[PDB]
Structure formats: structure tokens, C-alpha cells
Amino acid sequence: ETQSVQKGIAITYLHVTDQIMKNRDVIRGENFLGNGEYVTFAGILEANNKIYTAPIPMGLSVYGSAFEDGKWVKYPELVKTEDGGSNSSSYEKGELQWTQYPNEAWVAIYNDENFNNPTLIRTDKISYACGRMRSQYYQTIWAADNGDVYVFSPSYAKIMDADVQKTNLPAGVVRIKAGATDFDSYYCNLEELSGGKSFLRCWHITGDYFLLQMYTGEINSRGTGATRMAVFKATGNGDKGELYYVDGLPEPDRISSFSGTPFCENGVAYVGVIPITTNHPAIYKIDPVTHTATKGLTVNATGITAIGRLAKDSHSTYVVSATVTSANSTANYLLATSTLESGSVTPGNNGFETATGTAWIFYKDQYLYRLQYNQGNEGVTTAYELNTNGGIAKRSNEYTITRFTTYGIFGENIISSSAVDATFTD
Numbered sequence: 001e002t003q004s005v006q007k008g009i010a011i012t013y014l015h016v017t018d019q020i021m022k023n024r025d026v027i028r029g030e031n032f033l034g035n036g037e038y039v040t041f042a043g044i045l046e047a048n049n050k051i052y053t054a055p056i057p058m059g060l061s062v063y064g065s066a067f068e069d070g071k072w073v074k075y076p077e078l079v080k081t082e083d084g085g086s087n088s089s090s091y092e093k094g095e096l097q098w099t100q101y102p103n104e105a106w107v108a109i110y111n112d113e114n115f116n117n118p119t120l121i122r123t124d125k126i127s128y129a130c131g132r133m134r135s136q137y138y139q140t141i142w143a144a145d146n147g148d149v150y151v152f153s154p155s156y157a158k159i160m161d162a163d164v165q166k167t168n169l170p171a172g173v174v175r176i177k178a179g180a181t182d183f184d185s186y187y188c189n190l191e192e193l194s195g196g197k198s199f200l201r202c203w204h205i206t207g208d209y210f211l212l213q214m215y216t217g218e219i220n221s222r223g224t225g226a227t228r229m230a231v232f233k234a235t236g237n238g239d240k241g242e243l244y245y246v247d248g249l250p251e252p253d254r255i256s257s258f259s260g261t262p263f264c265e266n267g268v269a270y271v272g273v274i275p276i277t278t279n280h281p282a283i284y285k286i287d288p289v290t291h292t293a294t295k296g297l298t299v300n301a302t303g304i305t306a307i308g309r310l311a312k313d314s315h316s317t318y319v320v321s322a323t324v325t326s327a328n329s330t331a332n333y334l335l336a337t338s339t340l341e342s343g344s345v346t347p348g349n350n351g352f353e354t355a356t357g358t359a360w361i362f363y364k365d366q367y368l369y370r371l372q373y374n375q376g377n378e379g380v381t382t383a384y385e386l387n388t389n390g391g392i393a394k395r396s397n398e399y400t401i402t403r404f405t406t407y408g409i410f411g412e413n414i415i416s417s418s419a420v421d422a423t424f425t426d
């Protein structure tokens with residue numbers, strides 16, 4: 001029995017009720033899809049009492065390229081001859097970086113949070129189903145309210161250097177009917193409807209409506225120009241899909257960024273809009289039925305990084321995470337407000353100072369979890385709630401967690417994941 005370093009998939013659970021952190025045994029990532037490559041999970045989607053994730057191919061590890069004298073190497077000219085690269089895309093000699101099979105998408109369906117015996121299904125109609133920004137892999141699989149799972153691809157691989165690693169498929173969407181175990185016949189080419197544009201990430205709003213953060217020009221590694229929103233009605237136009245750019249937002253050349261995860265309530269989506277350069281961020285309400293946006297709460301801070309609701313007994317409030325960035329520091333404030341649609345909030349008092357967070361997740365209206373990314377080192381997390389006096393309070397337990405590149409919720413577990421180096425037997 002021979003042990004060696006191989007690629008695995010790490011899973012971290014934050015149980016919200018028991019307030020306990022667990023690591024799963026690392027899942028073997030090598031040859032996850034049957035072609036030798038290893039994978040990164042993108043998204044943890046709860047629907048139909050199951051977990052859906054997109055196993056995003058990463059190419060071949062050093063172990064994978066060497067395995068049985070290059071068995072898995074389709075394009076040997078791409079195997080790296082020396083260490084190189086930058087940031088989370090640094091590579092080592094012997095790697096084959098990024099997938100050799102860009103013209104397909106996989107989805108893994110798991111019966112529960114123990115992540116055993118996945119149903120793995122493939123489509124050749126779209127490229128892999130994630131968005132990309134730096135190290136992070138953005139969820140682009142989402143469930144309509146009836147349980148149908150829509151699988152979106154922005155065709156990020158079209159920007160790969162080598163022809164054989166670029167996808168030739170336009171950004172598009174496919175479907176897994178609720179309770180089905182394979183894709184059905186649905187397909188929507190989004191570039192045909194969008195004016196040739198793809199997207200950075202997307203989310204579910206309500207019903208069969210989804211929100212897409214659209215590019216003004218070509219998709220790119222830095223996310224430049226991801227400054228418009230569109231509403232996608234999946235079953236629109238006789239089950240062919242319909243895409244409408246959102247009206248009422250600032251001009252794209254006036255938007256610096258959007259806040260990251262929308263807050264959905266009563267059939268609409270609230271999103272923070274951070275303008276370039278006196279102009280303060282504000283929360284806009286996006287009505288998917290009319291694809292219209294209206295300006296609401298103003299946030300007197302640098303940016304907005306989370307929007308949600310917290311409650312305890314008879315108390316409840318909206319909560320807006322606001323960043324305050326100075327020349328020498330970056331601070332974060334949780335701000336309580338009774339409305340997202342008028343007025344303003346300012347740190348300096350109902351605010352509560354926290355560390356900054358790479359990702360913020362509301363668990364229902366009960367808890368707010370902060371997840372911090374730390375490059376190659378370990379991530380960090382803390383959690384917040386409303387006390388019995390309706391004030392914002394920090395939860396007792398904090399955690400050091402494995403490096404993560406995606407996250408989601410299933411049941412009472414917040415789940416985070418990444419592709420790791422790990423020892424495996426054989």
C-alpha cells in the first residue's frame with residue numbers, strides 16, 4: 001500500500017445549531033470525472049433534499065500527469081516544464097494547468113452532507129458551470145422554486161491561452177428537472193439573447209427568475225466591465241429562456257462594483273451598488289417581473305458586502321455589512337436598519353464593528369457568518385446574531401478553517417470547500 005501526495009477535495013462543516021466545526025475526511029480528487037483530472041467544487045446548492053455542485057476540472061496534478069506514463073495527458077505540449085505562474089494560479093513542473101476538456105459541464109448530486117456516492121452527469125451543450133474571480137469559484141447552479149435546477153456557464157474557458165483549452169461554446173444554461181437524475185432537453189444560448197455578452201456570476205431571485213451580473217465587453221480574468229445586471233426568466237418564451245437587461249441602475253461606467261450576494265425578499269432582489277469616486281454606495285431593489293431597479297437605502301461607507309435580515313423573539317432588523325477603507329486600514333461594520341428602500345445608514349451609531357470578510361452568509365434570518373480567505377494559509381470564520389434586546393451580537397465560537405474556494409448551505413450546515421494537496425493510499 002503506497003502513499004503519495006495527490007489532489008483531494010476538502011469539506012468543512014459549520015453546524016449552526018450545535019455550533020460545531022468538523023472536517024470531512026478528504027475526498028479523492030484525482031480522476032474525479034474519469035479522465036484523470038482533479039476538480040474544484042463550485043457551489044453547494046440545496047434543492048430537492050439533495051446537494052448539487054459543479055465539479056470544475058482543474059487539469060492534471062503532478063501525480064495525474066505522471067500516472068501510468070502519461071496515461072491522462074492528451075496535450076503533452078501543455079505539461080509545465082518548470083514552476084511558474086502567479087497567485088492562486090501558480091503552477092509547478094509536471095502540472096497540466098486547466099482542463100483539457102473545456103466543451104462540457106459536469107454536475108455532482110449528493111444525497112446528503114456526508115458527500116458519499118455522487119450521481120455524476122455530463123452535458124456537451126455548455127462549458128463548466130462556475131464564475132471565476134481570483135482564487136474563488138462562484139456558484140452558477142441554482143434552483144427555481146419548483147425544484148428544477150438550472151446550470152449556467154459563462155464559458156470562462158474561452159479566455160484560456162491555448163486553443164485546445166478554450167471552449168467554443170457560448171455562455172448558456174441547461175436544466176435538471178426536480179427529482180430527475182440527468183439533464184433534460186432544455187437549452188438556452190445566453191449570448192444570442194444578451195448581445196454577445198457573458199457574465200461574472202448569477203443567483204436565483206424567485207420563481208424561475210435569475211439575476212445575472214453581466215459584462216459590458218468581453219469576459220476577462222479581472223472581471224473588468226461586470227457592471228450591468230440582467231434578469232433571466234428560465235421558462236420564458238415557450239421554455240426557451242428570456243433575458244432582459246435591468247433598467248434603473250447607474251450607467252455602467254459609473255459603477256465600481258456590486259455587493260456580491262443579493263438579498264431576496266417578497267419576490268424582489270436587493271443589491272448594493274458601489275459607484276466610482278461625492279457618491280455613496282446604495283442598495284437598489286430589482287423587480288424581476290418588470291426588470292426595473294429603484295434606488296433605496298444609502299450607505300455612508302466605502303462599500304457594501306452583505307445584505308440580510310436577523311431576528312430573535314419579537315425583534316427583527318435588516319443588516320447591512322459596510323466596509324470602511326482608509327489609506328492604511330480596511331474596517332467592517334454591521335449596520336442595522338428598518339428599511340432597504342429609503343434613508344441612509346452611517347457607521348458611528350446601530351453599528352457593530354467586525355473584521356472584514358471574503359464571504360458573508362446569512363443562515364435564514366437567524367445567523368450571519370463571516371468567512372475570510374487567506375491565500376495559501378487557512379481561512380477564518382466568525383458568526384453573528386441578534387441578542388434578546390434586538391442588538392447585534394457576536395456568537396461565542398470562532399474557528400480556524402481549511403482554505404476555501406467555494407461555499408454554500410445544506411440543512412443546518414454551512415459548507416466550505418477547496419482542492420487540496422493530501423496524502424492518499426494508492
Ligand SMILES: O=C(N[C@H]1COC(=O)[C@@H](NC(=O)c2cc([C@@H]3O[C@H](CO)[C@@H](O)[C@H](O)[C@@H]3O)cc(O)c2O)COC(=O)[C@@H](NC(=O)c2cc([C@@H]3O[C@H](CO)[C@H](O)[C@H](O)[C@H]3O)cc(O)c2O)COC1=O)c1cccc(O)c1O
Nearest residue numbers: 086087088089090132133134135136221222373375376377
Ligand atoms: O486579498 C486578496 N489577496 C491579497 C494578498 O495576496 C498577495 O499579496 C499576492 N497573492 C498571493 O500570494 C496568493 C497565493 C496563493 C497560494 O499561495 C501559496 C503560499 O502560501 C502557494 O504556495 C500556493 O501555490 C497558492 O498559489 C493563493 C492566492 O489566491 C494568492 O493571491 C498578490 O496578489 C495581489 O496583490 C492581488 N491579487 C490578484 O491579483 C489575484 C489574481 C488572480 C487571477 O485570477 C484570474 C481569474 O479571476 C486568473 O485566473 C489568473 O490566473 C489569477 O492570477 C488570482 C489570485 O488569487 C489573486 O490574488 C490583490 O490581492 C492581495 O493583495 C484576495 C482576495 C480574494 C481572493 C483572493 O484569491 C485573494 O488573494
Ligand SMILES: [Ca+2]
Nearest residue numbers: 047143144145
Ligand atoms: Ca429553493
Ligand SMILES: [Ca+2]
Nearest residue numbers: 329330331353
Ligand atoms: Ca478599526
Ligand SMILES: [Cl-]
Nearest residue numbers: 144145146207
Ligand atoms: Cl418555479
Ligand SMILES: [Cl-]
Nearest residue numbers: 338339340341
Ligand atoms: Cl425594506
Ligand SMILES: [Fe+3]
Nearest residue numbers: 087088134135
Ligand atoms: Fe489570491
